[PDB]
Amino acid sequence: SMQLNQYTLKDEIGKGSYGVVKLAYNENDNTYYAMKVLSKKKLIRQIEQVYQEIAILKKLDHPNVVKLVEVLDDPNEDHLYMVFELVNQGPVMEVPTLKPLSEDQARFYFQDLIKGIEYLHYQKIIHRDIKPSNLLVGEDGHIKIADFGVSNEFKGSDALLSNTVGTPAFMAPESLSETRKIFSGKALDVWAMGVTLYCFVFGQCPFMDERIMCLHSKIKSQALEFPDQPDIAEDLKDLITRMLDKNPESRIVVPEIKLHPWVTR
Ligand SMILES: COCCOc1ccc2c(c1)ncn2-c1ccc2cccc(N3CCC(N)CC3)c2n1
C-alpha cells in the first residue's frame, strides 16, 4: 500500500487504455474509490489529451456513466491521479468466456448501455472503446460505462473522424481503410455496441484472428456468423445484424435501437 493525502492505494483493479486503476481507501469518509494512475513521463514517450479527458469527465453526470470525483496533479510529481466512484462488482464479463450471459441478463445490461451511450452522444462525446470489460456492474445490478481514455468531444450533430483507436476487435470496418478516410463517430459507437451485445450472449467476438491484418480483413469483408451455441431469439439476431451492418449509412441508429422489438420486450 501507499498513502496519498487522505487515500490509501491498494491492489490494481484494472488496466485500461492508459495507466492503471487502483482500489483506494479514503480515510476522511470511510469508503473506497477507484483511482486511475498515470505517469507523465510514460505519456510523454507513448499532457493535453489527459486534460481533455478530464474536461470531458467533468461534464458527465448520469447513472450509467462512472463519475469523476477529483483529480490530484502536482506539477512537482510524475504521477497524475484521477479519483472515480468505485463500482463494486467490476466488469460485466471477460472475453472470451464459456459462461455468457442469458438473453434476459443481456437485455437488462444492454438497456443500461443504450441509456449511457445516448447520454454521451447528447453531451457530444464519442466513447470509442465500448466493450464488455469497460462496463462495470454496480451494487444495484446496473452497468456504468468507464474508460474515456480514447474518447472524443465533437461539435454539431456528429464527430468527423480519421484516426483509428480503441480495441481492434471492436473497431468498425469504415475505420480500417488502407487510405485516409473520414467516418461518423456515432456509428462507430453503435458498431462497438453490436460487438458488445454479441459478446454478451456468445462469450466471444464475432470476428477474431491472432494476426491483426487478418482481423481487419474479416471485420471488413467476412459476413457475420452466429455460433451454434447458445441458440438465441430471431429478434436478437436481427438487432445484432443491424448494428453490425458494415455500411455505416444503413447501420441502425440509437433512436431506432430504442424501438427495436428485442429491446422493448
Ligand atoms: C472484480 O472487480 C472489482 C472492481 O473492479 C473495478 C474496476 C474498475 C473500476 C471499478 C471497479 N470501479 C470503477 N472503475 C473504474 C473507474 C475509472 C476508470 C477509468 C479508466 C479505466 C477504467 N477501467 C474500467 C474497467 C476495465 N476492465 C479496466 C479499466 C476505470 N475503471
Task: Walk me through this protein's architecture.
Belongs to the protein kinase superfamily. Ser/Thr protein kinase family. This protein has helices at residues 40-45, 48-59, 103-122, 185-202, 212-221, 234-243, 254-257, 261-264, and strands at residues 2-4, 7-14, 20-26, 31-39, 68-72, 79-85, 125-126, 135-137, 143-145, 152-153, 160-161, 183-184. It is an alpha+beta fold and 265 residues long. It has one domain (1-265). The protein has a six-stranded antiparallel sheet. It has a two-stranded antiparallel ribbon with strand order 7-10. A two-stranded antiparallel sheet has the order 8-9. Helix 3 packs antiparallel against helix 4 (185-202) and helix 4 (185-202) packs antiparallel against helix 6 (234-243). It is globular and about 55 Å long. The N and C termini lie far apart (47 Å). It binds the ligand COCCOc1ccc2c(c1)ncn2-c1ccc2cccc(N3CCC(N)CC3)c2n1.
Write a short abstract of this structure.
The PDB classes it as transferase. This protein has 265 residues and is α+β, with helices and mostly antiparallel strands.
List keywords for this structure.
monomer, 265 residues, alpha+beta, 6-stranded antiparallel beta sheet, two-stranded antiparallel sheet, binds ligand 34U, Calcium/calmodulin-dependent protein kinase kinase 2
- Give the termini separation: 47 Å
Small-molecule binders: the ligand COCCOc1ccc2c(c1)ncn2-c1ccc2cccc(N3CCC(N)CC3)c2n1
Total count of helical runs of at least 4 residues: 8
Number of domains: 1
Structural class: alpha+beta
Q: What Rg, in angstroms, do the CA atoms define?
A: 19 Å
Sketch the topology as an H/E string, one letter per element: EEEEHHEEHEEEEEEHHHHH
